[PDB]
Amino acid sequence: SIGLALLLLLLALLFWLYIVMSNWTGGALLVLYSFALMLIIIILIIFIFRRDLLCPLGGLGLLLLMITLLLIALWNLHGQALYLGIVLFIFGCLLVLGLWIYFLEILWRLGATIWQLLAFILAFFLAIILLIIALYLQQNWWTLLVDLLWLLLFMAILIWM
């Protein structure tokens, strides 16, 4: 149970490091792969730590993994099918925003001040903007930094539950 989850987590950082460091001329897909593997690492960490957060927070990671797999699939695609892929990713983004709103609603019920909630919104939006920057600025040293920042953000969310 916990032992195997730790074994994968100690193996998790042995893959993401390899993906990020290698293939210096990968492109916009390498950063997406690294972000997906960060989502897997986050899910593993949530499973190892307090497991009561799987529904509001682990589901966030799984749905982000689904969205970033859809984005990988429709990245190189170009044509008529792209309109049915973007609109589907739009429904995915709406649902991830709804899940984040639900998480904030259940956090607001646990005595969180308004400034803390605003800080969480700002941190999530900064994380999304930094991921977009990593998509545009395809340099590898920035993908590493944005993935570490995402891990720190989710670790802080876990710590402040």
Add this chain to the structure above:
Amino acid sequence: SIGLALLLLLLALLFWLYIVMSNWTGGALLVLYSFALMLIIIILIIFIFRRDLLCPLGGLGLLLLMITLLLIALWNLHGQALYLGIVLFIFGCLLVLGLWIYFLEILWRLGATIWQLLAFILAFFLAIILLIIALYLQQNWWTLLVDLLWLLLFMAILIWM
């Protein structure tokens, strides 16, 4: 929890059904993308159905996702780092076999005949061989069938314990 996880499963099925039937010319990595989404569906099924299999079998889903997401990183890359990628891949494949052995032990201790013990070994080997073949048959109708076969195999496990 159940309602949200069912909602993701409905969205994950739509994502997978769109992705498998989108790129009719890309038939080397689209199989990997569809197989990576199908492991998400299997994990969602496990999380909606009996959760006691999350530790033995959900970890298998996470490991299969990790391997099938590292496989793309090996794919496009063709430099010296591909050898390190193969080393990591065979290190994860030597652990997925161990996890399968561990699942075999708990299946035996729960009560299973010799015919049913080697039946799942044959099923798993057939499924992985069919996945390997699907990498060669780049059509999007063989990969859909092999993905549904994998779902059927991983659904016949939770039914038969």
